[PDB]
């Protein structure tokens, strides 16, 4: 049931990192679980530092919330920032100190594709407002896989592109009028891009929207609470119909409502 975001719920804390290594990170479930994973399988990456390669994998939600991983993957090259996503059994992440997106098949621990995002800024050119090298932000919605970034030609404004999940080819790109470094993070619900206004305020908002299906740029004032005052990662999961976020060592989730 597609529609426009009209409400976000309170953040619920599901797991809390115990070390500075997890002050920021990314955690995710696959909207299209493929064998041997299911809808419960959760991945977790603590992303503080310059040699991030451990992907924590949990078979059951109970294990994500309590206990050790079922499995740890060692990525063949360090991962950059908090923007990665899992889709169709592959982890999609950005090579550190590069503009390359890498497709890592989880069940075989094999790199299946690599692709430079043409013209994309990286490593502090067009981060989100908190920095953290967040130049390139992958996304999964109801129609598939996207990447959110900017370029010199776009002059810091958010660009978004549909991505072929098999070979990482860019299927179509849109250009917004939202300065990327002026928002705390971004996500896509039903082909519409949403931005969050601040990463520190307990009274932030979802403040912009750009509908790729009609080209309309829009302004909103939907309350969004950063319960722990440092949201480093905010994504949308079209299967659970919920936002997944990482807020100052805390892995939280947000209920939503669409019109
Ligand atoms: Ca995001
Ligand atoms: Na992302």
């Amino acid at each position: 049931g597609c529609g426009e975001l009209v409400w976000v719920g309170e953040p619920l804390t599901l797991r809390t990192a115990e070390t500075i290594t997890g002050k920021y990170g990314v955690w995710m479930r696959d909207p299209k679980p493929t064998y041997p994973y299911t809808q419960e399988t959760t991945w977790r990456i603590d992303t503080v530092g310059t040699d991030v390669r451990q992907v924590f994998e949990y078979d059951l939600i109970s294990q994500f919330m309590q206990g050790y991983p079922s499995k740890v993957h060692i990525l063949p090259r360090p991962l950059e920032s908090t923007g990665a996503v899992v889709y169709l059994g592959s982890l999609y992440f950005q090579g550190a100190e590069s503009r390359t997106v890498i497709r890592y098949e989880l069940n075989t621990e094999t790199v299946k594709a690599e692709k430079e995002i043409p013209g994309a800024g990286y490593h502090g050119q067009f981060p989100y407002s908190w920095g953290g090298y967040t130049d390139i932000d992958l996304a999964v919605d109801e129609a598939g896989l996207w990447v959110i970034y900017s370029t010199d030609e776009a002059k810091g404004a958010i660009v978004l592109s549909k991505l072929n999940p098999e070979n990482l080819e860019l299927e179509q790109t849109w250009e917004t009028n939202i300065r990327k470094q002026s928002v705390a993070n971004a996500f896509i619900i039903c082909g519409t891009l949403y931005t969050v206004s601040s990463y520190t305020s307990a009274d932030a908002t979802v403040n912009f929207a750009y509908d790729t299906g009609t080209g309309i740029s829009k302004t909103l004032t939907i309350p969004f609470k950063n319960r722990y005052k440092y949201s480093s990662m905010i994504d949308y999961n079209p299967l659970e119909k919920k936002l997944f976020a990482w807020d100052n060592l805390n892995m939280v989730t947000y209920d939503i409502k669409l019109s």
Side-chain angles (χ1 to χ4, degrees):
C2 266
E4 193 192 330
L5 188 69
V6 300
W7 175 82
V8 185
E10 294 281 325
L12 177 73
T13 304
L14 304 170
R15 181 82 183 241
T16 283
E18 302 193 66
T19 88
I20 178 65
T21 310
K23 182 169 192 81
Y24 27 84
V26 59
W27 75 280
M28 52 265 267
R29 315 197 156 111
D30 191 340
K32 265 129 166 47
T34 87
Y35 179 90
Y37 312 112
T38 81
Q39 271 142 30
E40 255 196 76
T41 314
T42 317
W43 295 266
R44 175 183 149 177
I45 318 189
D46 296 13
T47 71
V48 178
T50 60
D51 190 53
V52 171
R53 297 167 175 253
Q54 298 199 352
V55 179
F56 293 166
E57 172 178 290
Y58 307 79
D59 287 334
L60 294 182
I61 285 177
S62 35
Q63 292 170 320
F64 172 64
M65 301 172 61
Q66 302 287 343
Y68 280 86
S70 312
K71 213 253 188 281
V72 181
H73 307 276
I74 296 308
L75 296 177
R77 90 153 95 181
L79 167 155
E80 181 134 312
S81 189
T82 61
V85 310
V86 174
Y87 188 52
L88 284 172
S90 284
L91 174 70
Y92 294 82
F93 71 100
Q94 170 188 6
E97 303 196 302
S98 80
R99 55 161 68 95
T100 333
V101 53
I102 303 141
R103 181 199 161 183
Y104 176 86
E105 177 161 39
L106 286 159
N107 178 47
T108 62
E109 296 194 0
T110 306
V111 169
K112 306 261 304 185
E114 297 188 14
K115 183 92 230 322
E116 320 251 1
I117 314 297
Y122 66 102
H123 213 252
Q125 298 185 248
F126 311 116
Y128 290 130
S129 68
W130 74 269
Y133 302 132
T134 57
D135 300 57
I136 291 180
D137 185 1
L138 282 152
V140 186
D141 84 328
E142 282 85 14
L145 176 69
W146 311 62
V147 64
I148 307 164
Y149 62 106
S150 188
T151 63
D152 275 324
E153 51 245 58
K155 280 143 43 59
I158 287 165
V159 181
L160 64 162
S161 297
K162 249 285 194 75
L163 273 190
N164 187 314
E166 257 166 349
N167 56 21
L168 291 180
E169 269 308 293
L170 292 86
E171 301 197 328
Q172 182 181 8
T173 88
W174 294 257
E175 200 178 72
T176 71
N177 301 304
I178 311 156
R179 176 153 203 255
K180 186 159 187 305
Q181 313 166 243
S182 84
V183 301
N185 216 299
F187 50 87
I188 300 160
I189 308 192
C190 289
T192 305
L193 177 96
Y194 296 93
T195 62
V196 172
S197 66
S198 148
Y199 53 90
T200 45
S201 174
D203 292 317
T205 60
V206 178
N207 52 345
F208 299 103
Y210 171 89
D211 186 344
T212 53
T214 59
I216 304 299
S217 268
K218 198 176 288 255
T219 280
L220 294 98
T221 63
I222 304 188
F224 181 98
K225 186 168 259 62
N226 294 290
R227 151 81 97 70
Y228 301 100
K229 304 169 203 180
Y230 208 76
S231 301
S232 66
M233 191 282 294
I234 307 167
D235 273 17
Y236 175 67
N237 190 296
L239 183 65
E240 302 210 1
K241 286 321 174 82
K242 302 215 282 224
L243 309 187
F244 287 31
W246 195 296
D247 184 358
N248 212 4
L249 303 147
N250 289 278
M251 286 147 282
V252 304
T253 200
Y254 295 75
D255 200 72
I256 64 148
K257 187 219 175 124
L258 310 181
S259 72

